[PDB]
Amino acid sequence: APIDDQLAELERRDNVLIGLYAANLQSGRRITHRPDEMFAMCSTFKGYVAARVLQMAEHGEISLDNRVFVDADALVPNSPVTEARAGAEMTLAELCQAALQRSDNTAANLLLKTIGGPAAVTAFARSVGDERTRLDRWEVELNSAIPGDPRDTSTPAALAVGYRAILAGDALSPPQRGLLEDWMRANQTSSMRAGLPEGWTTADKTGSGDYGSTNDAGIAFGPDGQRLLLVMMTRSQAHDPKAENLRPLIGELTALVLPSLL
C-alpha cells in the first residue's frame, strides 16, 4: 500500500505510532494502519458512555432529565462544565453533553456511576460488536497509557465498529442516534476538523492522555452527502509520559487519508 508508506514516514518523522481505521460509508472502502494494535482510548470511551445512557433512557430505566448532584469533592481536573455547577445538580442529558462536547472529566465519572462503572462500558462495547475495548479505571487515572498496559485500551478497528454502531448503526433507535450525532457535532475539541475541507463537519470524540496518546474517533460529513468513519489513535514511541500530544498530526492524518477514501 502506498498510503501505507506515507504513514510509516509520519511514524518515523515524528517518533509516533499511528493507529487508523478509515472507511467510506457509502462506497464501503476502508483503509487501515495498526487497526488491531492496542492504544489507550482516553476520552473516546465517553461516546460509549453517552450511548449507553441514551439506550437506558429509551427503555425508561433512567430519564435524561434525571438530576445528579455535583459534589465539589468529586471534581477532578478538566471539568469546565461540572465545576460551574459544583454544589448543584445537572441532568443526565447535561452531563452527556459536557462529557462529549468539552470532555468534562467529572461529568464522565458521574455518568459512569449511573451506568455501572468501567465494567458497564466494557459490556456496552461487547454489545455493539466491539471486542477489544476494556475500561478498567475512572477519570483521570484511565489516561495513564503506560506502554504494554492493557488497561483502558482499545484498537482502531474495535473503536470503529462501536463508533459506527452508535452513530450510523442500530445500537440506538434511529431518532436517539440522531441526538447522539447532534451532541457530538456540537463538540469543541475536534482534532480531525482542522484537516477537513470547507463544508465538512464531524460528529467525533477526541481523547488525550500520557505518552502523547491523542485520539479522535467519529464520522466526517461531506457537503455533498458523503460520510467517512474516521478513527485515529496515536501515541509517542518514546517512554516519555509527558511527550507532547499529537493534535496537529490528527489534522494532517485527516487530510492525508481523505483523498484515498473519496
Swiss-Prot record:
E.C. no: 3.5.2.6
BP-aspect Gene Ontology terms: beta-lactam antibiotic catabolic process; response to antibiotic
SS bond partners: none
UniProt effect for mutating residue 50 to S: In amoxcillin-resistant strain
Consequence of changing residue 84 to E: In amoxcillin-resistant strain
Keywords, sorted A to Z: Antibiotic resistance, Hydrolase, Signal
Binding site for substrate: 205-207
Reaction(s) this enzyme catalyzes, per UniProt: a beta-lactam + H2O = a substituted beta-amino acid
Enzyme category, top tier: hydrolase
InterPro entries the record matches: Beta-lactam/transpept-like (IPR012338), Beta-lactam_cat (IPR045155), Beta-lactam_class-A (IPR000871), Beta-lactam_class-A_AS (IPR023650), TAT_signal (IPR006311)
Record PTM: Predicted to be exported by the Tat system. The position of the signal peptide cleavage has been experimentally proven.
GO MF term set: beta-lactamase activity
Residues covered by region (Disordered): 194-215
Active-site feature positions: 43 (acyl-ester intermediate)
Entry's family note: Belongs to the class-A beta-lactamase family.
Something else known: The class A beta-lactamase family has a specific amino-acid numbering system, sometimes called Ambler or ABL numbering and often misspelt as Amber. A multiple sequence alignment was used to derive a consensus sequence and then the consensus was numbered taking into account insertions and deletions. This allows use of identical numbers, e.g. for active site residues, despite differences in protein length. UniProt always uses natural numbering of residues, hence there appear to be differences in numbering between this entry and some papers.
Name this protein carries in UniProt: Beta-lactamase
Record organism: Mycolicibacterium fortuitum (Mycobacterium fortuitum)
